[PDB]
Every structure is written in structure tokens, then in C-alpha cells.
Amino acid sequence: EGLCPPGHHISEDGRDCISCKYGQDYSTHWNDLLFCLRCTRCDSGEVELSPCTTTRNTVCQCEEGTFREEDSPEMCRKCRTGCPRGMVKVGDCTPWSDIECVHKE
Amino acid sequence: SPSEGLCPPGHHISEDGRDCISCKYGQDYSTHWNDLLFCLRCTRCDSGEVELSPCTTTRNTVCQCEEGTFREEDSPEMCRKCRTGCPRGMVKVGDCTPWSDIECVHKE
Amino acid sequence: PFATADIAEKMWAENYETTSPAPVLVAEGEQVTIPCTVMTHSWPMVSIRARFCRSHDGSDELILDAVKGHRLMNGLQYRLPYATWNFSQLHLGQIFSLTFNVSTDTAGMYECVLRNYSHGLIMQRFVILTQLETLSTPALGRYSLGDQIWSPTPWRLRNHRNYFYIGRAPDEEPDRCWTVIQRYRLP
Amino acid sequence: PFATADIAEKMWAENYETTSPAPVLVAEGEQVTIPCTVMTHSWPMVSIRARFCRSHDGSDELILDAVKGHRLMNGLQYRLPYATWNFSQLHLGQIFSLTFNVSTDTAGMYECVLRNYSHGLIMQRFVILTQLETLPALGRYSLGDQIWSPTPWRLRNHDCGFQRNYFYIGREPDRCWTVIQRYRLPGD
Ligand SMILES: *[C@@H]1O[C@H](CO)[C@@H](O[C@@H]2O[C@H](CO)[C@@H](O)[C@H](O)[C@H]2NC(C)=O)[C@H](O)[C@H]1NC(C)=O
Ligand SMILES: *[C@@H]1O[C@H](CO)[C@@H](O[C@@H]2O[C@H](CO)[C@@H](O)[C@H](O)[C@H]2NC(C)=O)[C@H](O)[C@H]1NC(C)=O
Ligand SMILES: *[C@@H]1O[C@H](CO)[C@@H](O)[C@H](O)[C@H]1NC(C)=O
Ligand SMILES: [Ca+2]
Ligand SMILES: [Ca+2]
Ligand SMILES: [Ca+2]
Ligand SMILES: [Ca+2]
Ligand code: NA
Structure with missing residues (x-):
């Protein structure tokens, strides 16, 4: 269709x-x-992994050490460098995830 | 039935x-x-309101705002003390009734 | 002399003011629909609550069953005799709505309400106007977020102490919609 | 590998946050509808924009004509091959919507958007979920930051499929996480 x-x-x-x-x-x-x-134009903090063609959008990735926020405004955020005392680190810093910090309390 | x-x-x-x-x-x-x-449920007139007419099984209580107050139609639909008269320089164009505040217009 | 009705214990949703749009100027004779969307909730009933700008006290309600949408009481019948209504079960929520032709006597504040026998949670208000009056032509647009009075067909704005209305394709009775209109502005 | 799409220049409505409800936990195989209501406006198109929690990059849109409601591009057909949609003119505004059956692959962030060829004004977001992972008194909707369900009496508690549990309703990275975490479970 x-x-x-x-x-x-x-x-x-x-x-x-x-x-x-x-x-x-x-x-x-x-x-x-x-x-x-219109094709997406990669921003500062983003690397162009693949250009726009007439058949697919540009692929923009968040720079190493930063990750993609999916809440508004969907920009790249600096990853946390670690967890506070009394918390364990679970997740680790990828271009699609900050590190997770879980309390024991 | x-x-x-x-x-x-x-x-x-x-x-x-x-x-x-x-x-x-x-x-x-x-x-x-x-x-x-x-x-x-019948409306119970809040203070600030005068009961003009009682609830019956067929019609609601009629509650009217006290003289010197007016019914606000915006949330929370309560009675509000009409504001004071219009400032010198401004003309009074609405008068305080149970359904209206006083209204002022400037010469600007 | 006339029978009135109302919600005994009114309540307003937290986001009532942010979800309710600025009033809308519409031409007489236009068929409009008041659209209501609710997330699955636990009240037994919902309603479309009307307070007309002209010659009206209290509020009139189309009360529907919240689960299946059946009409329980049409308190709107006198004033909107030819009105129809709709109910759709979306699982995650329900949409219910009210369709009528706009006239001077049907201009009003229309609300989506979750309802029981004593309480109503007012979720959202629409204000449908046929005429706007002024003292001394604003660039009336279509809808944009804000406190700005607007119209679906603003290119048909006419100018009859001025009087604004939307032409098809005065008075002295009190306007019950005034205390809400005044909280918004012309462009 | 897979071709992707997005909106080139995203904007958000002022009240985006206050009108978008907390995420909702729904049973797999339930038919749901994303409802979108919009006041008459001046954009040429409208869309329902989907970012799935799983195996999905970019966003996929069902773009409809804003005046008449006909389909312009169904960017959703591969991930939602059975989805149907509706459009109603109410004069003062329009209701458009997307109906599909929930599954693990259809869980996602679903937005209502005013659209042109470069820009989308994102009006409202719905987050549809099938699973919640933990390391609670779930209710039906009631304003706020509280995750909910249309059928909370059917909430179940598994282990996999730490100190960890799996919440679902019933009969790999999760891209929804950065939104999910902004809301909470019920304490009691
Ligand atoms: C009708 O709705 C109202 C509002 O939800 C209910 O009144 C509440 O009742 C709960 C539990 O009984 C209490 O926690 C609150 O104090 C009441 N809320 C308010 C705002 O007053 C009422 O119970 C409902 N009526 C029926 C018969 O179910
Ligand atoms: C697509 O929509 C965008 C945003 O509404 C338009 O860009 C705006 O154009 C207006 C009028 O020309 C300007 O006043 C603004 O500066 C722009 N706003 C933003 C946020 O960029 C764009 O022109 C539209 N595209 C088309 C073809 O109409
Ligand atoms: C109302 O007006 C509409 C056009 O807006 C027209 O189709 C219809 O004849 C009218 N219907 C009723 C029930 O008055
Ligand atoms: Ca009685
Ligand atoms: Ca009452
Ligand atoms: Ca369900
Ligand atoms: Ca989305
Ligand atoms: Na269809």
C-alpha cells in the first residue's frame, strides 16, 4: 500500500x-x-556512523563516555563515572545506557 | 416498573x-x-452561599453567592469577594452581583 | 422555576489547567464534537458536563456507564435535543464524546468528568464560543499551545463596542462564560 | 543492516510532560489503542511515532494527512503488520489512533505528533509495557508518576524468563529504560 x-x-x-x-x-x-x-543532521556529542541515503536516515550515535536519553529532548548525556558509597554499580556506560546504581538500604 | x-x-x-x-x-x-x-447527592450550600431553594427528589439545591461576592466559573467554582471599585483613571464597566465581579477598563 | 442539577462534590485533576485548551470561536451551525479521553480508572460513571454561556444555572450532564458506555441519564436533552454521543473501549482507556451543532444557546464550558453519585473529578474543559465582544481585528489563528483564543476557521473572522464572530461558510443577558474567558487573551 | 527513520527536528509541546501519563503494564495479546486528540492546527500531516523497547533504533511513524486522514506512509508495517488506524474530523480538532495487539516486540514509547517534512511537534507520549524487572499495590490510572495497569488484579511475580523479580500481567537491552525509571512503582 x-x-x-x-x-x-x-x-x-x-x-x-x-x-x-x-x-x-x-x-x-x-x-x-x-x-x-529531511535527513537527520548529527549534533555535537554525536558521531555519524552512516550517512543518509534516499532510502534510510543518517545513523547518529552518542560519543564514547556519553549515552542516549530517550526522554525529552532525546539528546546525549554524560555517563556517571561511578556510584555513591553504599551503592553497587550494575549497568555500565554504553551509547544507549548510563551505569545503574542500586542502594542496599 | x-x-x-x-x-x-x-x-x-x-x-x-x-x-x-x-x-x-x-x-x-x-x-x-x-x-x-x-x-x-444534593449540593449543600457552603458558607458564603445562600440557599435560595431546597433540594427535592427532582431538582438540586439552588445556592447563591452572598451579596458582595460573585460566582467564579473557573476552578474551583466557589464564591469570591468582589474586588474593590475601579482605580482613578479607569472606568467601571461591570458591577458586583452574585454572578459578576466588578469590571474595569483603562482609557488606554 | 426550572429544575437544575450539578456535581455535589467537585474536584479537579492535577493537570486540569494544562490539558484544557484556550476557548475556541466557532461559527453557528457548525457541527463540533467534544472529545474526552480517560485512562482506565475505577469510577463507575463518566460524564460530559455542560454549563451554557446563556440563560443557565448549575450544570447538565450526559452520564454514561464507565465500563460499557451506556447512557444512564441524559441531563443535556432539553438544551441539546439533537445531540449524539459515542463511547470507545481502548482497553488502556476509554474515549467518549458529544456531537452537536453550535448555536448561541449551546456556546458553553464543556467538561470531561469521572463520576460517582456525589463526586466528580473534572479532567478537562473545552470552551466553545460563538461571539466575542470588545471595547475602544486581532490576528486570530488556528490552535497553538497557550492562553490565546483561536478558531478552526479563522479566515472567516468578521467584525459587526465591537463584536467578533465567525461567518458561516447583539444582546444584554449575562454571559456565564465571562469569568473563564477573561483568563485568556486575544492575539 | 536495517534501514532506520526518525524526525529530523524534534520539538515538544509545553505540556508534553503533564499530559503524558505514567507507563502502563498490559498483558501480552491484549488489544490496545493509542488515542491522539489534536486541536485544529496548521501542520500538513500528523503521525503516531513508535520507539520499541527492543531491537529498535530510530523511530517509526504512521504519517497521515492532517486534513483528510489518509495514510501517507506506514512506517510501522513491519513491526506491527496487523495494526489498524482511525481518523475523525471533529471540526474543532481531530482524533487519530492506532490499534494493535500488545506483545514483547510491540512494547514501546508511542507519541502523537504534528508533522511536516523536517519537523515534528511531539504532543503526548504513551509508554506501553509487558514486563517490569526488579532487584506492590498496582492500581488503575490515577494522576501522577505511578506505573499502572488496566487489569491490576492479574499482576504476577516470576523470577526470570541479584535479589530479582519479573512483573507482568498475563492471560538484550531495553530502550524504554531511561523513560521507565523516571516513574515509580506503588509502595504499598
Ligand atoms: C465517590 O468518589 C469520592 C472521591 O473518590 C469518594 O470519596 C473518597 O472516599 C475515599 C474512600 O472512601 C476516601 O479516601 C476519601 O476521603 C474520599 N475522597 C474525597 C475527595 O472526599 C467516595 O467514596 C465515592 N463514593 C462511593 C459511594 O464510592
Ligand atoms: C516545518 O515546521 C517548522 C517548525 O514549525 C518550520 O520552521 C519554522 O518556520 C517558521 C515560519 O517560516 C519560522 O518562523 C520559524 O523560525 C521556524 N521554527 C522552527 C522551530 O524552526 C518549517 O518552516 C516547516 N517546513 C515547511 C516546509 O513549512
Ligand atoms: C446540524 O447541522 C449539520 C451541518 O453542520 C447538518 O448535517 C444537520 O442537518 C444538522 N443536524 C441536526 C440533527 O440538527
Ligand atoms: Ca432531595
Ligand atoms: Ca448535586
Ligand atoms: Ca491488561
Ligand atoms: Ca516514540
Ligand atoms: Na486501517
Whole structure:
């Protein structure tokens, strides 16, 4: 379902599939969009692991020592360097997780 | 027995759907034909309010804000002392009633 | 002379003021729907509570069964005789709603309420206006978060002591909606 | 490997936090609906945006036309192949929604979004969960920071599948964690 394949958007007359612009925009699925979706531009604190193509978004990862927050505003956060006294460290610092600190109290 | 599955104003329906039971005067009421398991509790006028009319099984208590106060329609819907008159320079355009505060407009 | 009704013990949700949008100016004759969404909760009933701007005391309620959505009492019948309503079970919550044509006598404060026989938890308020009056043309937009009066069709704003309304595609009776309108602003 | 998507330039509504309810624990195989209500506005599109707790990067959107409600792109079809959706014009606003059956792979963060080709204004978030891991008096919804369930009387307590338990309702990294932790279980 959708007139145009990935990498394309539909023309104004509904007849044609026009290609997205490489490095500008994209669309991942069959679709009836009048325009392609803008590519994500990696931020400071982020490494571009893979560029935008007309068929997939840029892959931006949080720099080593920082992790991806999924709450608003979904930016990179500095990992904790460890747990306070009386707490044990469980998780460790990845680009998708801070370290976890659990109390014994 | 219910009319069209419904019990009359001043009544609520029984759990099994067979009977219409009268609301208790002074305590609760229903204004319309209904399938309620219970009648609605009557409003008790808070201080700051004057009871114009009592609850009956068929209509709610009518509570009016005391003279010099007005009914606020925003949360929490309580009576509020009307504010003082309009400042010199400003014109009075609303007057303090049980349903309105005083209203002031500037010459600006 | 007329029978009135109300919620005996009113209560307001914590986020009542943040979820309730600015009042909306709508043209007479337009069919609108008051949309209510609640997370699965433990009250026996829900309602759509109306307080009309004109000639009205207390509040009128469409009381529905919270589980199955059946009408228990339509307290709205006199004032909105041709109104219809809907109830959808989403498991995680229910949507219930009220559909009517807007007129001068149906302008009002409309609320989504969780209800028992004595108490109601007012979750959210919508204020539907047909006319706005002023003393001495603001850039009325469509909805944007804030305290800004707005309209779905603002390109049809007209200007009849000024009088604002939305043209299709005065008075002196008290306006019960005033104390709520005044807490918002024109653009 | 897998192609991914997202919103290029995200924004959040002022009241995003106060209108988004605490996460909800639902039984696997229950049919749920994400309901989205929006006041008439001036964006060309709307979407239901999904970030799944598991095996998922970026976000997937069901993009609908904001005026008429027709599907523009169902970015959700692979992870939710049976999902259905609805759209209603209420004049003053629109209700759009997504209906699917809950499972471990459909647990996730589900947002209502005003959308154009580069920007999305994220209005409201729903967090649907099937499992809670611990190292409680669960209720139905009642305003706040408190995790809940539509059917709390069916809450169960397993071990795996420390000092650790597995909470679920019933008959690998978890990307929802940084949101989940911002809320709490009931004490009593
Ligand atoms: C109707 O709703 C109200 C509000 O939930 C209930 O009153 C509360 O009752 C609980 C337990 O009985 C108490 O903890 C509170 O003191 C009451 N709350 C308030 C705000 O007054 C009432 O019990 C409900 N009525 C029925 C018959 O279930
Ligand atoms: C997509 O939406 C965004 C955000 O609403 C638009 O960017 C805004 O454009 C307005 C009007 O041109 C400006 O006043 C703002 O500076 C922009 N806001 C932000 C937050 O960037 C963008 O123009 C829209 N795209 C299209 C094609 O209309
Ligand atoms: C209300 O007006 C609508 C158009 O907005 C029209 O379809 C209908 O005839 C009216 N319905 C009732 C019940 O008055
Ligand atoms: Ca009585
Ligand atoms: Ca009452
Ligand atoms: Ca469930
Ligand atoms: Ca999401
Ligand atoms: Na569908």
C-alpha cells in the first residue's frame, strides 16, 4: 500500500514517483508523500556512523563516555563515572545506557 | 416498573432492573428519566452561599453567592469577594452581583 | 422555576489547567464534537458536563456507564435535543464524546468528568464560543499551545463596542462564560 | 543492516510532560489503542511515532494527512503488520489512533505528533509495557508518576524468563529504560 517505493515521493499530479535528493531527504517505505523526509543532521556529542541515503536516515550515535536519553529532548548525556558509597554499580556506560546504581538500604 | 427501561425523575433503578425506587428527599435526586443505581447527592450550600431553594427528589439545591461576592466559573467554582471599585483613571464597566465581579477598563 | 442539577462534590485533576485548551470561536451551525479521553480508572460513571454561556444555572450532564458506555441519564436533552454521543473501549482507556451543532444557546464550558453519585473529578474543559465582544481585528489563528483564543476557521473572522464572530461558510443577558474567558487573551 | 527513520527536528509541546501519563503494564495479546486528540492546527500531516523497547533504533511513524486522514506512509508495517488506524474530523480538532495487539516486540514509547517534512511537534507520549524487572499495590490510572495497569488484579511475580523479580500481567537491552525509571512503582 502506497504508490511510490522507498527513495521516492509522489508528484503533484499523483501520477509520478520522483526520487528523493541524496544527502537531503529520504523515505523508508512505500508511500504517498508529496515530499521526502529531511535527513537527520548529527549534533555535537554525536558521531555519524552512516550517512543518509534516499532510502534510510543518517545513523547518529552518542560519543564514547556519553549515552542516549530517550526522554525529552532525546539528546546525549554524560555517563556517571561511578556510584555513591553504599551503592553497587550494575549497568555500565554504553551509547544507549548510563551505569545503574542500586542502594542496599 | 421502568417505562422504556427507564425510571422517572425523582427515582433511580434497582440492581435487577425490576423496580423504580424513590430518591430520599433532602439527600439526593434525579432530574431526568434514568438507569441510575443511585440518585445524585444534593449540593449543600457552603458558607458564603445562600440557599435560595431546597433540594427535592427532582431538582438540586439552588445556592447563591452572598451579596458582595460573585460566582467564579473557573476552578474551583466557589464564591469570591468582589474586588474593590475601579482605580482613578479607569472606568467601571461591570458591577458586583452574585454572578459578576466588578469590571474595569483603562482609557488606554 | 426550572429544575437544575450539578456535581455535589467537585474536584479537579492535577493537570486540569494544562490539558484544557484556550476557548475556541466557532461559527453557528457548525457541527463540533467534544472529545474526552480517560485512562482506565475505577469510577463507575463518566460524564460530559455542560454549563451554557446563556440563560443557565448549575450544570447538565450526559452520564454514561464507565465500563460499557451506556447512557444512564441524559441531563443535556432539553438544551441539546439533537445531540449524539459515542463511547470507545481502548482497553488502556476509554474515549467518549458529544456531537452537536453550535448555536448561541449551546456556546458553553464543556467538561470531561469521572463520576460517582456525589463526586466528580473534572479532567478537562473545552470552551466553545460563538461571539466575542470588545471595547475602544486581532490576528486570530488556528490552535497553538497557550492562553490565546483561536478558531478552526479563522479566515472567516468578521467584525459587526465591537463584536467578533465567525461567518458561516447583539444582546444584554449575562454571559456565564465571562469569568473563564477573561483568563485568556486575544492575539 | 536495517534501514532506520526518525524526525529530523524534534520539538515538544509545553505540556508534553503533564499530559503524558505514567507507563502502563498490559498483558501480552491484549488489544490496545493509542488515542491522539489534536486541536485544529496548521501542520500538513500528523503521525503516531513508535520507539520499541527492543531491537529498535530510530523511530517509526504512521504519517497521515492532517486534513483528510489518509495514510501517507506506514512506517510501522513491519513491526506491527496487523495494526489498524482511525481518523475523525471533529471540526474543532481531530482524533487519530492506532490499534494493535500488545506483545514483547510491540512494547514501546508511542507519541502523537504534528508533522511536516523536517519537523515534528511531539504532543503526548504513551509508554506501553509487558514486563517490569526488579532487584506492590498496582492500581488503575490515577494522576501522577505511578506505573499502572488496566487489569491490576492479574499482576504476577516470576523470577526470570541479584535479589530479582519479573512483573507482568498475563492471560538484550531495553530502550524504554531511561523513560521507565523516571516513574515509580506503588509502595504499598
Ligand atoms: C465517590 O468518589 C469520592 C472521591 O473518590 C469518594 O470519596 C473518597 O472516599 C475515599 C474512600 O472512601 C476516601 O479516601 C476519601 O476521603 C474520599 N475522597 C474525597 C475527595 O472526599 C467516595 O467514596 C465515592 N463514593 C462511593 C459511594 O464510592
Ligand atoms: C516545518 O515546521 C517548522 C517548525 O514549525 C518550520 O520552521 C519554522 O518556520 C517558521 C515560519 O517560516 C519560522 O518562523 C520559524 O523560525 C521556524 N521554527 C522552527 C522551530 O524552526 C518549517 O518552516 C516547516 N517546513 C515547511 C516546509 O513549512
Ligand atoms: C446540524 O447541522 C449539520 C451541518 O453542520 C447538518 O448535517 C444537520 O442537518 C444538522 N443536524 C441536526 C440533527 O440538527
Ligand atoms: Ca432531595
Ligand atoms: Ca448535586
Ligand atoms: Ca491488561
Ligand atoms: Ca516514540
Ligand atoms: Na486501517
